[PDB]
C-alpha cells in the first residue's frame, strides 16, 4: 500500500505565539500551548519519521490577534513559508482586508499554492488575480502525485469583505468538474481542502465523486478517537467517516482552531488510489513539545513592532469611557454602547436592495467589559487601553436567533438583578425596558429592534417567531454567563473578528469619539 | 483739514460671486448684488475721486460657500490682493481650518498686513507664526501716516478651531498699550480694525484712549443714516457715535455682511490727528454698478474647479436619506438626525475639565430640509445632492436659550400640527415627547436634553431657568417660521458655518453613513 501522512491546521486565527489553554494570551509559559515555533518542532519530528507527508491549511490564518492588525498577512506568508506548508485553502477571513489585502501580503508572498475552486472574478480584477489562487494543485509526493482541490464558504460575502467583483459559487457544483478533470489527467488520489464548515465538509464527502479525503475548517470542529487530551469536547470520531453516494468510506477531518492541535491522518491507498484505511488523531501542542529556538527567536524579533504599536494613539475620546462594573452590570453604560456600535460597524457588508445592512443588532455581556478609559490623557486611546477593557481574546460573532430566544436572553440579563453579575446586557440596535418589580422571567416589558429589511432604519417590536441576526461575543454564543438558550436555540453561528481589533478599527475610523448613554436600556 | 476716506468690508463669508438680495445664490442676474467683481468697480471709482483712501477688511472672509470648501482661503488672498486691500483684521472664521489653514493660504500669500493685537502664541508655534500677523501696522497715506490696530473676538475658541497654542486676550487690555505705543512714535491718527461684534466695538471706542475710529464686524451689524436702500433694517446711525471716556466723539462703523455693501466713512482730521467730523454711509452694491469684466473673467476661470468638485463623491450612504416633507414635517426623519449630528460634530471645540463639549443640542426646522437623497446611486453623495437638501445658503449658528424659551419653541413646533408646515423641529441631543390631544401650548409632555457639564453624556430633564447652548439655522435664530421667542429671548448669537459645508465635512469624515430614526421625537 502507499501510505500518506496528512498534517493539517485550520482557523489558526493569528495565534503566531503560544497561548493559554483557552487560546488567549500566554501567562503561565510552562502550561502554554500551540504557536508556530512549537508547531515547527512537531512537523519537523514527523517529517523525519514518515516518508510521504503533506502539511495543509484549511484557511482562516487571517484575523485574531495584534499580529494581524500590524502585519496584515505578512506574518502568515512568512511563518507558513518557514513551516513549508504544501497548500492552503482560502478561508472567509482571508477577505477581511478586501481582495487587495489578500493579493499583496499573502498571494504574492506564499511559496505554496493557495486554493479555491468556487471563487470567480469578473472585470479587470479577473486579469489582476488570474493564477494567484488556483482551483487545485497536483503535488508530487515521493513517486506519486496527489491532487488538492480547494473550496471556500459560499457565505463569505456575509462574513468578510470580499467586495462585489468576486462570486462565491456553491461548493459541490464547482468541485465536481475539477475532480472529474483530475481523474482524466490520471490523478487518482484527491484531497478536498477547504473552508465551509463541518456540515458542508460531510456533504462534499457524500456527494463529490472521486474525493478520497476532506480536510475542513471554519466551524472550529474538534474530532477525536478516544479519551480527549484537553478541555475540547469532540463533535465525533477522528476521522469522521462519511459513506459516499458511490459506496466509498470517505474520511472527514478538522483540527479545532487557534493552532492548539496539529491534525494527523494516515491514509493507505491501493495502486488505483482507493483508500484502504485511514486513522489518526489531532496532536495537542502542549508544553511537553519544545518551541523551536530559531522560529521562537524570529517570533521575538517580529514582536518588537507589535509592542511599539500597542502604545500608539489610535484615536481620541472627549468623554470618559465608563467601563466600570457599577455602571455596565446595572444600567446602560457608554463603553457598552461604543463596543456595540463598533460591532455593528465591523459587520457592514455588501447589501441587496433588500436590506440597508444584513445585521442591525448587538448584545454584549456587561461582565465582559473589564476597564474604563479615562479621557484626561489628552484624550488618547491606545491598543493597550483597549486590551484592558477586552482582555479575554474573544471574537464578536454573528448568530441567528428567534425573537423568542432573544426575549429569553433579556429575561436572563435581569433574572437576579442587583448582584453585580456579568450577564446584564449592553446593546446596539435594541431598545429594552425592564420592570424589576415583576417576577424573574417576566421583567421585559418592551423590546424593540432596528429593522434590516428597510431603506430607513427604524425600531419595531420584536416578533417571537422572526429570526434575527445578532452580533455578540463568542463567549455568549457558546452559552457563557448562563445563556444556555442562545447555545441551544441558535440557528446559525459564524465566528467573527477579534474583540479588541473590532473596537480599535472603529475608533481609528471615527478619530474622535463621544459615546452617550441615550436610553437603549430603561427601567420602569 | 486732512480728509481720509475709509472703505470697509466685514463678514464677506466667501461671497466671491454676486448673490441674490438675501445673499444666497444669484438666480436673476439683473437683480443680483455684491461679489468681488462689482466691489472692484466701486473701489476703483472711489480711488479715482478721493486722494486719501484706505480699504480695510474687519475679518471673516473665510467660510460661507463652496469657494472656501475648495480653495480654503487661496481665493481670499487672491481676490483681496486683486482689490488691493490695505489691511485686514483676523476674524473668528479665519481659524476654521486651524492655525495651519490660516498660515498657509492666507498669511503667506496676502500682500497686505493681517492684524490682531490680542492673540498670542506659545511654544514652537510662536516662532513659526512670528510676524505673519501683527498687532498693528503704520501705513503711509499721502504725506501722512495712519496706525491700524487689530483685534479678534476673545470668544474665538468657542466659535472656530484655533487650537490650544493660541490665547485670545481681552481686547481693551491688549489694545491700550499698543495705542499708547503708537502715540509715543508720533502716530496721531489711529483706527481700531477688528472682529468682536458691535457691542465690544462700542466699548473699545469708549475705553481705549487715542482710538479715533472703530471699524468692526462679527455681528453683521447694519448701520445707516437715512432711509435704508434695501431690506436690512439699521441697528443705528452710520457712523454710530460713542462718547469716549476722555470726551471725544468716536465713530463706530460696520457694513452688514456677505459683500452686499461697501462701508464708506469720510473723516476730517486736524493737524494733531483730532477728528473734526465724520460722515458717510454703506453703499449698496446693486446691479446699477457693473461687475469689472477682468475680475469677472477671473472669477469664471476659478469657478471651473468648483463645478468639477460639486459632482465628486464626498462619501456614501447605505440608507435612504429621508428628507421628504411627509416625514420631516410630521415626525423624526433620518435626514434631520444626520444634519443635526453633523451640526453637533461641527461644534466640537476644545473643552475644559468642566465639559465634554460646550454644546450638545441641535434644533432644525423640518421645512428647511428640501430633498431626500437616494442611496441607489452606488450610495454616492455629492455636494450637488446636499445643495438640493439645503438650498437656502444659511448657516448653523450657536445661540444661548433659557429652557423656558426652548420649551416654547417645542410647543410652537406642533402648535398647528398636521398641515405640513415648516416649523416642526428635527433634533440632536434632545428627546421630546408630544401629546397632540392636549391644547396648543401644552403639548410637550417630556423634554430631556444631553448634558454638557458631565464626563459621560446622558439625558436629564430640561430646566426652565437654565441657559442651554443650541446649534440651529440662522433662519431660526432670526425668528423665522414664527419662532419669535428665539429671536426675542436668546442671550447670545454667533453665526456659524455654511449649512451645506457642515453636512459635507461630516459625511467626508464618516465615509459611510447609516442614520436611523431612533426615538428622539415620540408622540403619546
Ligand atoms: N472568557 C470570557 N469572555 C467574556 N466574558 C467573560 C469571560 N470570562 C468571564 N467573563 C465575564 O466575567 C464575569 C465575571 O467577572 P467577575 O465578577 O469580575 O469575576 C462573567 O460573569 C462574564 O460576564
Ligand atoms: N431661507 C430659509 N432658510 C431656511 N428655511 C427656510 C427658508 N425659507 C423658507 N424655509 C422653510 O421653508 C418652509 C416653507 O416651505 P414650503 O411649504 O415648501 O413653501 C418654511 O416653513 C421654512 O421651514
Ligand atoms: Ca482515489
Ligand atoms: Ca487721533
Ligand atoms: Zn475561522
Ligand atoms: Zn472561517
Ligand atoms: Zn462672520
Ligand atoms: Zn465673526
Residue numbers in the entry:
A (entry chain A), B (entry chain A): 26 to 549
Task: Give excerpts from the publication.
Human ecto-5-nucleotidase (CD73) is involved in purinergic signalling, which influences a diverse range of biological processes. CD73 hydrolyses AMP and is the major control point for the levels of extracellular adenosine. CD73 is a non-covalent homodimer, which is attached via a glycosylphosphatidyl-inositol (GPI) anchor to the extracellular membrane. The N-terminal domain (residues 26–317) contains the metal-binding site, which can coordinate two zinc ions, whereas the C-terminal domain (residues 337–549) houses the substrate binding site.
We characterised the initial step of AMP hydrolysis, the binding mode of AMP to the open conformation of CD73 and compared that to other monophosphate substrates. The structure of CD73 in complex with AMP was determined to 1.69 Å resolution, and the AMP substrate is well defined by the electron density indicating full occupancy and no flexibility. The adenosine base is positioned by a π-stacking interaction with Phe417 and Phe500. There are no amino acid side chains within hydrogen bonding distance to the adenine ring, except for the interaction of N3 with the NH2-group of Asn390 at a rather long distance of 3.3 Å. The N1 of adenine interacts with the protein via two water molecules. The ribose group of AMP is positioned by hydrogen bonds with Asn390 and Asp506, whereas the phosphate group is coordinated by Arg354 and Arg395. An exception is Phe500, which exists in two conformations in the unliganded enzyme and the conformation with occupancy 0.36 disappears in the nucleotide-bound structure due to steric overlap with the adenine ring. Superposition of CD73open × AMP with CD73closed × AMPCP showed that the base and sugar moieties superimposed very well, confirming our structures to be a suitable means of studying the binding of alternative monophosphate substrates. In addition, concerning inhibitor development, it is evident, due to the optimal superposition of AMP and AMPCP between the open and closed form structures, that the open form is a suitable means for studying the binding of monophosphate nucleotides other than AMP to CD73. CD73 has a Km for AMP of 10.5 μM and a Vmax of 301.2 U/mg.
